[PDB]
Each structure stands twice: as structure tokens, then as C-alpha cells.
């Protein structure tokens with residue numbers, strides 16, 4: 001029962017494919033092979049850049065040029081001692097892109113009681129949607145708001161007497177991929 | 192008019208229907224080296240006659256006419272009330288204890304096929 | 314312009330994602346019978362003209378759709394038709410391997426997302 | 434003199450004509466159907482018309498559709514073409530006013546109100562904007578500040594309210610798409626009162 005491989009594409013800049021191997025007797029260097037099923041260059045590729053945990057294979061890192069979103073990515077884990085103990089997963093890499101967190105969070109008034117939250121993301125943009133969370137020093141929880149490729153957020157009624165905290169995260173969905181996983185949270189900012 | 196699963200498999204026997212109830216669907220499957228035509232129908236629907244027509248190219252209702260190229264096994268979707276006759280394949284002796292058919296029935300929202308009371312031995 | 318094309322592609326994407334969401338879920342007990350129908354798949358789909366492959370499967374798509382007893386196939390398919398035709402502008406080659414609707418819808422979604430992402 | 438129409442994003446084109454029987458005829462360039470409506474008098478020299486393309490929430494047009502829109506008046510035996518337009522429906526959007534306004538939660542100094550958008554196409558996804566306004570007892574609707582929501586947000590929390598006070602609230606919506614797209618009508622005012 002081979003370990004599951006999880007692959008993430010980090011800001012479409014590179015990709016970590018990892019697995020925890022420790023769930024087996026005898027310390028084992030499992031190997032990774034991959035291929036792009038049903039396209040040009042569909043040859044079986046060897047890892048070429050192994051990641052290690054406790055001197056045992058734990059992952060693979062693929063460089064930008066090894067990444068083809070939109071093309072079916074097949075990963076194979078292999079027992080080096082027994083060929084028949086192999087497991088393969090078919091992955092859609094555009095569903096596995098993770099953006100770097102939103103940056104340059106600014107607040108700006110268009111009225112004495114209306115503010116606008118703005119921010120930046122490294123590379124993608126039309127390919128990103130956002131989640132805005134805010135709360136006041138008086139709230140027991142975050143208010144959240146889904147935001148499209150306008151990486152803006154309007155707050156039309158704000159209380160000067162209260163202190164606000166805002167944070168934003170981003171996601172590669174739904175226009176250029178269907179990622180389920182969010183970037184990490186931005187640095188929070190306060191009003 | 193739903194009928195969830197398909198009729199049970201009896202060892203060394205096959206089943207056929209003589210007459211198909213309205214709501215039955217016959218798939219448009221093709222033989223090896225053949226695919227259903229572009230923009231073709233995925234099935235034929237009994238309404239009585241069949242509302243579509245299956246066709247292949249190189250890569251109550253009656254039993255529909257055999258179209259040019261076909262998968263050997265016809266894939267059907269039956270509906271509640273469909274009776275299905277079982278028989279031991281050529282060379283096999285039939286032992287009967289009760290009905291040799293399966294009928295699609297409908298409980299409290301859950302369809303089922305009755306058990307054909309038939310054993311096949313060589 | 315690119316922005317017109319990008320918008321058309323998003324709208325096509327949304328129509329397809331609507332169908333996928335509508336069929337691929339609990340509270341659709343038709344799903345497993347729908348999964349048995351064979352859809353035909355583009356050998357290559359990297360550019361707008363490859364949308365010919367989609368167009369030719371719209372008819373069987375509507376049929377699989379019509380099997381839901383809940384979504385509004387006739388309009389929906391007529392809308393996808395007209396957008397596809399605007400976008401596509403050939404001789405479509407299909408893969409040997411057939412697909413379920415789910416695989417078929419996801420292929421076409423991937424196609425759209427693939428072009429949209431380059432468009433800006 | 435003027436012939437102006439708006440698509441509500443679903444199955445309605447609303448037309449206004451200013452220059453006895455007259456009609457608007459709609460000819461989609463790529464569909465096997467057509468529609469008309471009897472123009473009826475509004476202003477002294479204004480006529481209005483609604484083209485019902487299908488059921489309320491049905492998606493009867495698309496962003497690639499072009500509809501040829503003709504105004505026809507009787508003139509004896511036949512019909513006379515009075516006006517023409519090549520109407521790109523997604524370039525001329527105007528939505529129904531938001532509906533189902535209600536108080537989610539009222540305090541003494543706060544209120545959360547939600548709404549629903551009516552016959553708005555799934556094509557817009559989140560690419561919408563809203564504007565809201567509050568009628569307070571001292572002031573008129575005209576004097577009420579515009580509250581900008583540059584996102585799809587179907588609620589607002591009004592802060593800095595005064596206890597034991599009667600307010601009214603209104604909201605309107607706009608798709609981001611389209612060159613001649615305009616704000617929807619304001620919703621029916623929702624009257625509410627802050628707690629004592």
C-alpha cells in the first residue's frame with residue numbers, strides 16, 4: 001500500500017511532489033517517475049531532483065520547464081526492490097497551483113466612512129480570485145468576502161471608534177484552473 | 192420509470208427480453224475498430240417506437256433491427272415492470288425451482304430485480 | 314481582440330462548469346447511469362479551431378443532459394453552440410479512448426482555462 | 434428620433450421609442466426564432482415595449498448574439514420600418530432592481546440588510562458592482578451618500594446609526610460588462626428601525 005504523493009505547483013514557478021515514506025519496514029528509497037499522458041513528449045521521466053527526509057526520499061522538485069499545466073500529469077511511486085509494487089496518480093496541475101500570498105495591502109478612504117482595501121500578487125492576476133477577511137476589536141469572528149480578479153475590496157460603512165484588522169488570501173480558480181487550495185494569508189493590516 | 196441496477200448474473204446462463212417496456216434505453220455501442228458517428232445519439236429511447244437511431248463508422252417496443260456495426264453485447268436500461276427471461280447456454284442442463292425470469296419491481300423508492308430460480312449445470 | 318475572445322472563452326467555461334456542477338454531485342441519482350455513456354475526445358485541443366471536436370459532441374451531450382429529472386439543456390446547449398461557433402472560427406481527429414461526461418466536461422474546461430491563461 | 438433598448442441578461446429586452454399601430458420586432462442573427470411586442474404610449478411622444486424571449490430566468494441570448502431590432506408602424510396595407518438597430522445584448526445590459534430585501538440583524542447603532550439579485554445571468558459570475566443608499570429622517574434620497582460595493586456582495590452592515598430611528602434602505606446593481614450597460618433601477622425601499 002504505497003504512500004500517496006501530493007504535488008503542488010508554487011506560483012507556477014516550480015513544483016514539489018512529496019510523500020511520507022516512514023510507514024514501512026526497512027528504510028526505503030522509493031523512486032518517482034512522471035509523464036505527460038496523451039500529448040507531445042510523453043516519455044517516462046526520472047525524478048532528477050530528489051528531496052530527502054532523514055536521508056530517505058520524501059519528494060521531488062520539478063523546475064518550471066518540467067511543468068505543463070493543462071496537460072495530464074501522471075506520477076508513479078515505485079518500490080526499488082519489487083517492480084510490481086508501483087502506484088500511479090493522474091493529476092491536473094492547474095488544479096494544484098498555489099499563489100504566493102497577497103502583498104502591498106493598503107487602505108484608502110473615498111469618504112470619511114468608506115474605505116477601500118487594495119493589494120498585489122506576484123505574477124498571476126486575471127487567474128486569481130480572493131478571500132477577504134476582516135474583523136473589528138469588537139468582533140468574535142472574521143467577516144469574509146469572495147473577490148474576483150479586481151483585487152479590490154469596498155467597505156461602505158466603517159466605524160472610526162472601532163479598530164479593524166484586514167487580511168487577504170488568493171487562489172488559482174476558476175478562470176485559469178480549478179484549485180481548491182488557497183495561498184497563505186497576507187500580513188494583516190489595521191485601521 | 193427508473194430501475195436502478197441490472198438483472199442478476201446466473202452462472203452458465205444468459206438473459207433476454209422479448210418485449211421492452213416504454214422508458215427502456217438501448218446504448219449505441221460499436222464493435223472494435225468502430226465508433227458511433229459524429230453527433231450521433233448515445234442511446235435509443237422507447238416511447239411505441241424508438242426515438243433515436245444508432246450508427247457506426249470506422250475509428251411496448253420490439254427488439255430493434257441490427258445496425259451495420261455493433262458491440263457484441265447490447266447494453267440496455269430497463270424500467271420497472273420489465274420481465275427478463277433466463278436460459279442455460281447451449282450445452283447446459285437447466286434445473287428449475289420456480290420462475291426462470293427476473294422482474295424489475297419498485298419498493299419504497301428502491302427498485303430491485305427478482306431472483307430467477309434457476310441453476311445451470313453441464 | 315484578445316479581450317473579446319477571453320470573455321467568450323470565460324462564458325463557455327461557465328456554461329460547462331454549470332453542467333459539471335449540476336451533474337457531478339449527490340442529489341443527482343442519475344450520475345452512475347450517465348457515467349456509462351461514451352463521449353469522444355479530441356486528439357489535440359490546444360487552439361480555437363480544435364473546438365470542432367466539442368461542437369460535434371453537443372448533440373449527445375444534450376441527450377445525457379435530458380436524463381436529469383431535477384438545469385435546462387435546450388437553451389444551455391444552443392448557447393454553447395453559438396459561442397463555440399464564434400470562437401472556433403477544421404477536420405477534427407478524436408482519441409481512441411472514450412470518456413464519461415465528467416472526463417469530457419473536464420477536458421473542455423481544461424481547454425478553455427489553457428487558452429484564457431495565455432490571453433492575458 | 435430615439436430608439437433605445439436594454440437586455441436584462443436573461444429573457445427580456447426592454448425598448449423605448451420616441452419619434453397608429455407600432456411594434457418592435459427582434460431578429461436574432463443566429464437563432465431559429467423571432468419576437469415582437471406592441472408599443473404602448475408612456476410620455477407624450479414616448480412609446481415603450483417589452484420583448485419576452487422566454488421564461489423569467491431562462492438564458493435566451495449570449496455574448497456572441499446580435500439581434501436586429503426593428504421599429505415598425507402600420508402605414509396602410511403593409512408595415513413601414515421606422516428605426517433600426519444592430520443590438521448587441523451584452524453591450525446593453527440593465528438588470529432588474531434587487532429584490533427580497535430584509536433585515537438580517539438590527540441593533541441600536543447597526544443594521545445588516547441582505548438582498549437578492551433577480552434575473553441575472555450566470556455569465557456575469559462575480560463581475561458585478563452594487564450601489565446602496567440610506568434615507569435618514571433629516572434628509573432626502575437625493576441627499577443620501579452613495580455607498581459603493583466594487584464586488585458581488587449581497588449584504589451591507591450599516592454602522593454609526595442612531596438608536597430608536599426610522600430608516601429606509603435602497604440598492605442597485607450593474608454588470609461590469611458592456612459599453613452601454615447602465616445601473617439597474619433602485620430596489621423598493623426597505624423600511625426598518627434601529628432598536629431603542
Ligand SMILES: *[C@@H]1O[C@H](CO)[C@@H](O[C@@H]2O[C@H](CO)[C@@H](O)[C@H](O)[C@H]2NC(C)=O)[C@H](O)[C@H]1NC(C)=O
Pocket residue numbers: 010016051052059061
Ligand atoms: C518545496 O521543497 C523544498 C525542498 O524540500 C522546501 O524547502 C525547504 O524548506 C524547509 C524550511 O526550513 C527546510 O526543509 C529547508 O530549509 C528547505 N529545503 C532545502 C533548502 O533543501 C520547501 O519548503 C517546499 N515548499 C515550497 C513552498 O517551496
Ligand SMILES: *[C@@H]1O[C@H](CO)[C@@H](O[C@@H]2O[C@H](CO)[C@@H](O)[C@H](O)[C@H]2NC(C)=O)[C@H](O)[C@H]1NC(C)=O
Pocket residue numbers: 142143144537545546547586587588589590
Ligand atoms: C450580514 O448578513 C449576511 C447574510 O446573512 C452575512 O453574510 C453571510 O455570512 C456567512 C458567514 O460569513 C457566509 O458564509 C455567507 O456566504 C454570507 N452570505 C452572503 C450572501 O454573503 C454577513 O456576514 C453579515 N454581515 C456582517 C458584517 O455581520
Ligand SMILES: *[C@@H]1O[C@H](CO)[C@@H](O)[C@H](O)[C@H]1NC(C)=O
Pocket residue numbers: 027028029055056057
Ligand atoms: C537513499 O539514497 C541516498 C542517496 O542516494 C543513500 O545515501 C541512502 O543510503 C539511501 N537509503 C536507502 C537505500 O536505504
Ligand SMILES: *[C@@H]1O[C@H](CO)[C@@H](O)[C@H](O)[C@H]1NC(C)=O
Pocket residue numbers: 104106118120
Ligand atoms: C502599493 O499600492 C499602492 C496603492 O495602489 C500604490 O500606490 C503603491 O505604489 C504600491 N506600492 C508598491 C510600489 O508596491
